[PDB]
Subunit: 160 residues, 12 copies
């Protein structure tokens, strides 16, 4: 009983946190990225190698993707127990996959230094990241929230 | 039955994905485009030759264009089975044409280097693109979604 | 019968296209305009001579102006066949005048080079435009939409 | 009868024109203002002397000020012919005063050159304005609209 | 009777004026502040000494603070003559205090020059302000509006 | 009785103050941060060491976190005295913890100078902060509001 | 009799004037030559077109060339009236030819402005010369001295 | 008797002073000449107008010119009282003319500021001279030496 | 008889011309060499490829080398007809070899443009030379003098 | 007896020291003089105020001036005991005057900082000198040598 | 017999070649040395590591050192066969040692690229040399001359 | 006997080495001295603290000073065994004192890094020296030569 309330509260909290404040930490991600070199075009290559995909893009995609089964169920109901089981299983699988993917993609920390050896950069150069601590805190917070969501989903699945 | 629900869900998902996050990857498309030269006016010419039309503009136009028949049908109903068949055929043709056009215009990847030989640039110069990986991922995702939409439309057409 | 539906659909489509995407192509119109000279104040004069009025301003003004008769009719009705005829004639005249004015003002293409001979620029200098292809495509699209609107208005006028 | 409808249409048209497009022509008023000198602080002084108050600020203030009597009448009615006469007289006086003030403040054209002789600028220097033609067109359009409004108000006043 | 209507109109007018146009004059307050020196860090110190708190921040705080008693009364009524007297007294005191505080903080004019003698600036340097005339006009207008509000509040207090 | 009204008023006042004006003081936090050195990458490291987390982020997180129990209670009621006691205790604990955390994290003032000795900066360098006075005022105001909230919560807890 | 003394004095005076002070006016001929353009390589082309050969080089060559017959006569005498006549004729011819060549090459004045239309310069540009007045004075002085020398040589030739 | 010794000593002293130290004060005459403007080509024009001919050039020419009669007399003697008288008269005339010419050309002081109104400089600008005091001292010293020389020459002329 | 005198005069003339004026045309050979690129190190490589050895170095070496046999003969005489013949043959061979080498190394003209395709320069770039006309004139003059010397040496060789 | 030898040795030593090494310490006197300001023309004024006359110029003038009586005596002897006495007195007076003048002009040390308050510099600025220690050592050494010379001259004067 | 003449000629030729032209190739050795980095102080360290001692310094030292025995012999003779033998042996040893030292120090070629990994340079950077070809030619020429000198010295030693 | 010859040879060798090549290593001593900071005036102070007196100045002074007794003896002889002894003692003392002074002033090596903590430099900064290896080699060579000179002087002193 309380599990559903907690799940809804956690989902809304995650959505609000991502929407309100997330899109400002990464505003100047590339403008403040500097490398120690004179070669034109090294900054772009090194930034693209360091950060292939931004964290906020991944989190937005995950948020939108993990809420499709509810829309499908609502649409079916409007047009109108098996659907419940199928959607619960799909939600659990989606959440677990997204959590594992985040872990394998980003890790647990954002270092303040990067070593870049991509053309046109000559040999290996050093580049400096902007705001590592805030991004590390964001990473840890999102991981914790996703873990709580996964735990609640598994508990609900095992209830039936 | 389920086909209509899936089609609506896919359409709404595509619209949301394009609207929320698409208009930020391409924000600094031209500000971070750099060429290796001293000649004034080479950057503008080379950028215009590399990217005649931005991806987001094309996707917005496609999204708006593929939803006209529904508006026409709604307007006719408000003023008030042949119309259904005609609009289904028109939608299928529009989707197929837009998919083929996207493929012929952009391809499947965005390279990180460009070779530019347009006046006033002297002989051939080299220019460097910003964020190739994110744009490649966006291209592949949009192509997949459009393919799914085309498949569903063809299935619905063949149902009757 | 279908003519009214098509006219409304075209009007709404034009309004949406102008509103959503139009105000971003011209965002950096003057920041990326460069001339080959060292004289202060030549860039401003040459930009003002090349582009006295931006396209988006003209299109917004046209959109707002071509929808006044409907507001007048609605206001008269709220306060409450001759008015219908008068407003149809006024709309036709406004649309034709705006189309001819656009043609005489801008033409059909935006060249990538400009020759500037305005004070304080010494003799004749060369300046380079930003994004000619997108603006040419926009010009052609708007001209086509306006032509379709004019054709439909003339057909409706000749119906009675 | 038609006079009231025309007055309302003109007021709404003016408000929409000012709101939608006005706040973008003057966005870079000071960033693109350049003077021919090396002295620090001459640009700020010369810009402040050339343009003490921006046009858009004046127009917004005028728009907000010329619509107070209607609010007063509505509030009195909610709390609940002399009030009608008093508010008509007040509106006429406000409109005439604002028109005369605009004429005495700005004139009919915005020149492309300015001569500046304010400290710390040494002797007389020359400064260059950005977008004179668009601002001149805006000035003329606003003057015409205000004149039409004044004419309609005087006609309504003389009706009774 | 008319006093309440005038007070409400003045309050709404002040709120609208502050909200719509106020937040654009001060947009580039610090970017266009220049001092005549080569020492790093002198600009920040001199700007902070010249303008400890921006005018718009103070005005927003005053606007929000002078409308608390109404919210308290509304909340008490929803939960449900002494409260009326207490809230009137509180409003009068708040308005008078804010007016006196504004006068003691800012004055009546914004000079175009500042003399700065704060570390790390060596001896005394000169700095140049941006847009003094507009800010002076804003100061005078806000002072006049606040004075009118205080007069009306005192009249209402003395009525009973 | 009055305690609930005061608590609600204080909460709404805090939310409005944070939302409307807070997100503009810290807009240029990193762009105007300057250090006295020539070494690339020293600015980023020194800024990250001086300000690990921005104040506005912390305040937004606190505001969102201190209002979860109300949402939980509302959800339980919609699904439908112990819950009241539990949520009151949780709110008190959350507020006290957040206040103590703010005190231990930030303190009571923002100095205008910082001493930085982080790699790649050689030995110890000096960096200069932007807008210390406004941020100090914000710190003190937020601390006072939070203290008032804690006092009211403790009073309500002791009432029962 | 006096003619020989005057000729020797004039020759020595010319040599001393050229040697001592001539090689310093033209020291910064190319470093202070500036053109109004941004195109790389325009300065070199325009300087080479304006001044194919420096004046001092021509004068040094003339000085060395007009004194060969004396060396030939001295060498013949050391090895040891016809030779006298032949060398006088040769000297007269050399002096006349050099004077006419100087006139046809340089003229009588050095203007302070030049119009340059050589690749890579686009269309026609303007360039600014350094020290026109000193070079004009030098030109006139050298022409006068050469004329006096020619007159004396012709007088000596006609004596016999 | 002593007059000849004093004249020879003064001549040798003047020659040595001019030769050894004179050619270093004016080494950076044009490199350190700065004008307050942004217009290319204003520095060259203003420097040429301020200093048409350098002082050292004039002094070298005067030194070389005032010693020709001695060379003529020596040459005549080698080839071998009227010549004595003629050369004395010529020397006196040359010295007086050169002194008057120096006075009319340069004056008695070198100011530290110049007002320049020559094309391409717009209106009147201000330029700053390098080393005024040393050049003033040099001017006065040379004038005094030349005056002493003239006095001695006149005394010798009047002796016979 | 006259041949020896002419040969000595030509040799001395060549030596004087090379010594006095040659070492100033090439003073700024590398400082004024500019290439159209942003790549560091392209200027050095392109200059070294365009001008492996300077003309003046070659001419100085040739001048010193073509006068060794005279020194050898003088030394032998001091220590003290076959030697005469041997040294004449050696001189003729040296002069012919140096002339042919100059022709094969440099040619007859110095172009004003160079095409450079050496690492690190990307593809082919364009570089601009300084003072082509003076260097071409010098080349032609030196070639003519060397040819005259060779002709005289051959005539003397054939005399015996 | 030994006094004459010591005087000659000291004079030659002073001349050699001044000639060989003196003219290199002051080579970059003005190029390395920097002031903390942005105002054009402040560097020239402040340098001219700090160093009206260079030390080396004064020392060269003194060296040349203190050796005139010997030249006068030599000239009189060539043309050919009172002259001896007169020249000794003149030399003593010249040396004493030059020593006192040096002391009153320069002092005993060259500080590394200067405070400048001359137009166009605003208020008082700070400027930094180049090579204070070497110049101080030179000052002390020259003062000591001049003192020794004065002592020897006085001893010789008192001998007779 | 001829060996002594050849040795003297070679020595004088080497001295002249080194003196006249050698001191101009290396004039801009360090000014045109560029490295691809932004770190201050990397250029100095990398230049010092690449070229510890300049070639011209070594050659001058060798030239001066290999001619001491002749001075010693001349001094002994002036003061006035064993000395002959001793000085010949010393000269041979000195020449052989200097040749071997040159070979071990410099080699046979000067590359156009250098790899630098000295503090403060981060990891390994690339630097570009100026005029490699001329310096290689100089190296080879000096080596050949020194070898010829060594051969002649050994022949003379073996003669006795 | 041989000792005098060796002493003269060493003295002449030292003089030649110092004169010919010494004055070029230190030509750019201050132009290539760089410190890691942004503060104006830190470079001058740090250079003056690192190198109070240049090595070449000290060596020139020592060379000139150690040869005074010979001049005194020559002058006494021209005017014309105790003098011999006195001058030998004076020379020995001068040489020993100069050697010890050099050791105490400079040491044995020139490091490539310097730590500077002089006003206006903030705290301690790092500066980079130019050409440490050449200067170290020069130091060692001069020390060795001076030691040899001292040894020879002591041997000569002990001979008698
Ligand atoms: C300064 C505050 C303004 C923030 C503006 C930023 C973004 C727009 C708002 C939300 C987008 C962010 C995250 C995902 C939110 C909603 C997805 C809809 C899900 C659904 O419907 O199933
Ligand atoms: C210029 C004014 C515009 C400001 C835009 C900025 C931010 C968007 C608005 C609010 C976010 C700021 C603070 C927290 C507010 C609400 C949290 C929701 C709490 C709940 O629902 O429990
Ligand atoms: C600052 C003064 C130093 C000036 C140095 C400049 C040049 C060197 C001197 C002279 C060269 C100039 C002009 C021609 C002079 C002599 C030619 C020799 C003629 C002959 O022998 O038949
Ligand atoms: C401004 C004029 C000063 C020029 C100074 C330049 C160079 C020094 C002089 C001459 C060197 C140039 C060319 C070759 C001359 C002589 C070689 C000696 C031949 C021999 O002895 O067999
Ligand atoms: C442009 C030409 C001027 C060149 C000036 C350069 C240097 C000065 C001259 C010579 C120094 C160079 C090399 C060695 C020469 C002589 C050493 C003396 C040997 C001895 O006496 O035993």
């Amino acid at each position: 009983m309380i599990g559903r309330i907690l799940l809804t509260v956690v989902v809304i909290f995650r959505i609000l946190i991502v929407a309100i404040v997330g899109e400002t930490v990464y505003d100047d991600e590339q403008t403040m990225f500097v490398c120690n070199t004179l070669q034109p075009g090294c900054n772009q290559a090194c930034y693209d190698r360091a950060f292939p995909i931004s964290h906020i893009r991944y989190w937005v995609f995950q948020i939108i993707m993990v809420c499709t089964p509810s829309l499908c169920f609502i649409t079916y109901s409007v047009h109108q127990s098996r659907f419940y089981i199928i959607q619960v299983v799909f939600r659990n699988a989606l959440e677990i996959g997204f959590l594992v993917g985040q872990y394998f993609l980003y890790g647990f920390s954002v270092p303040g230094l990067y070593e870049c050896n991509r053309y046109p950069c000559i040999k290996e150069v050093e580049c400096y990241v902007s705001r590592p601590t805030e991004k590390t805190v964001f990473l840890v917070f999102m991981f914790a929230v996703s873990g709580i969501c996964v735990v609640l989903n598994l508990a609900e699945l095992n209830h039936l």
